[PDB]
Design a protein around this ligand. Structure first.
Ligand SMILES: Nc1ncnc2c1ncn2[C@@H]1O[C@H](COP(=O)(O)OP(=O)(O)OP(=O)(O)O)[C@@H](O)[C@H]1O
Ligand SMILES: [Mg+2]
Ligand SMILES: [Zn+2]
Ligand SMILES: [Zn+2]
Length: 421
């Protein structure tokens, strides 16, 4: 019912190591449950809120081990670097690691340890020694970037068996009751605290447009012209359905001599740290990406997001656009789509085998098409999917305004009802 305010020493720790002056509410609710109440958590946090602080902060505060489990190996490398820049010792642990590195974890060097779901199953005795010798503040089972996953996730029911005293934070991307029930049974969570941040990003304007037949003609509205050169109005990410289309979009932007970078799924640590530096320093105006996570696209002042093609589904779409406007200033997210787009092609779906995943692909395909075809508020459609209920239109202060979405804006441009309270 009531959450106590963080004490002085807790706020000071958050300032020294994470560079924040105060907690956001759901962050504190999750942190306080884990740190002070030792309670299992299922935390529904939309992207951009600060998921990663909820499991990084407690172990740093008490100087103990925090165990983070995630299937995305490159993302965990990116976080370990970010933590090292913040003076926080962290490592990514696997069988490929030296026996020497395992020594430092036993001795307690690393506040935050990253492992894959597979590694965690085969080294349970190692964890209990870490519990006995050093002490574990929490176990973070992310699975909020889960795509096409398995046995790996059902082998984690042993954590509460081997480590009954260690709280578990389960981060998730939807408020779905079905997902929450599955997570609770899989992890054997005990009366878990449930939180939800909500999913709105009021500073993102949502537009959908049809393609015109040529890449340059589609991108022309998004370019401004200095008397010498063409440029985007601001830092821009362009999401493509494939690396072939990324190279096509890249080729057209060279014709205008635009600072561009590509961001794909097999890039090395150096390549990802190079894109990050160039993107944040504005040395490249635009990133054309085939993935929706990692260092390279982690920038605070991305002004424009363009989907050059229909997105695969709402979950990917929400994550992709959530990289924009992280500074809280105005941003725009445009989809450029055609009915023949790859992520809207049903006929390709026949060739792949698995049934009821083709049906899931079918349902996501049809849901995505309904969104792109909608004449109603696009913000309402997205929030209703992630809240798993019917979000009432114009309850939030942004919906129904010229800043909300192209359908609201055009309706207000044609004698719409600017709603007074
Ligand atoms: N309490 C806070 N006060 C101010 N800024 C914060 C706070 N917590 C987090 N942030 C900042 O908000 C931004 C979003 O946080 P973060 O980078 O952890 O995203 P995320 O939700 O974990 O994303 P993803 O889904 O990609 O993992 C970052 O710039 C982070 O430093
Ligand atoms: Mg994160
Ligand atoms: Zn309490
Ligand atoms: Zn709207």
């Amino acid at each position: 019912f009531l959450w106590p305010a963080p004490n002085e020493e807790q706020v000071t720790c958050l300032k020294m190591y994470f560079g924040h002056s105060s907690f956001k509410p759901v962050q504190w609710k999750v942190i306080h449950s884990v740190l002070e109440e030792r309670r299992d958590n299922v935390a529904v946090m939309a992207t951009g809120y600060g998921k990663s602080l909820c499991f990084q902060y407690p172990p740093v505060y008490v100087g103990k081990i925090g165990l983070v489990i995630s299937p995305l190996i490159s993302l965990m490398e990116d976080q370990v670097l970010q933590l090292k820049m913040s003076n926080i010792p962290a490592c990514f642990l696997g069988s490929a690691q030296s026996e020497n590195v395992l020594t430092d974890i036993k001795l307690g060097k690393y506040r935050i340890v990253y492992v894959t779901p597979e590694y965690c199953s085969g080294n349970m005795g190692l964890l209990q020694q870490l519990e006995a010798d050093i002490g574990i503040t929490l176990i973070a089972v992310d699975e909020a970037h889960c795509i096409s996953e398995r046995d790996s996730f059902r082998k984690l029911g042993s954590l509460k068996t081997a480590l009954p005293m260690v709280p578990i934070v389960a981060l998730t991307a939807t408020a779905s009751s079905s997902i929450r029930e599955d997570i609770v049974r899989c992890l054997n969570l005990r009366n878990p605290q449930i939180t939800c941040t909500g999913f709105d990003r009021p500073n993102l304007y949502l537009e959908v447009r049809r393609k015109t037949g040529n890449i340059l003609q589609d991108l022309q509205p998004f370019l401004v012209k200095t008397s010498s050169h063409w440029e985007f109005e601001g830092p821009t990410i362009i999401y493509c359905p494939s690396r072939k289309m990324t190279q096509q979009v890249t080729g057209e932007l060279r014709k205008l001599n635009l600072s561009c970078g590509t961001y794909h799924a097999g890039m090395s640590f150096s390549t990802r740290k190079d894109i990050h530096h160039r993107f944040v320093r504005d040395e490249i105006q635009c990133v054309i990406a085939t993935i929706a996570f990692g260092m390279g696209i982690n920038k605070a002042d991305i002004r424009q997001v363009i989907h050059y093609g229909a997105p695969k589904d709402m979950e990917s779409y929400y994550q992709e656009i959530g990289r924009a406007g992280r500074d809280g200033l105005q941003s725009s997210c445009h989809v450029l789509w055609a009915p023949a787009d790859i992520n809207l092609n049903r006929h390709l779906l026949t060739e792949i085998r698995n049934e009821k995943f083709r049906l899931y692909k079918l349902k996501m395909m049809a849901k995505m098409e309904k969104y792109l075809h909608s004449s109603r508020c696009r913000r309402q459609i997205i929030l209703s999917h992630f809240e798993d209920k019917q979000v009432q239109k114009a309850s939030l202060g942004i919906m129904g305004t010229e800043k909300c979405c192209d359908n609201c804006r055009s309706r207000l441009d044609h004698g719409g009802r600017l709603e007074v309270l």
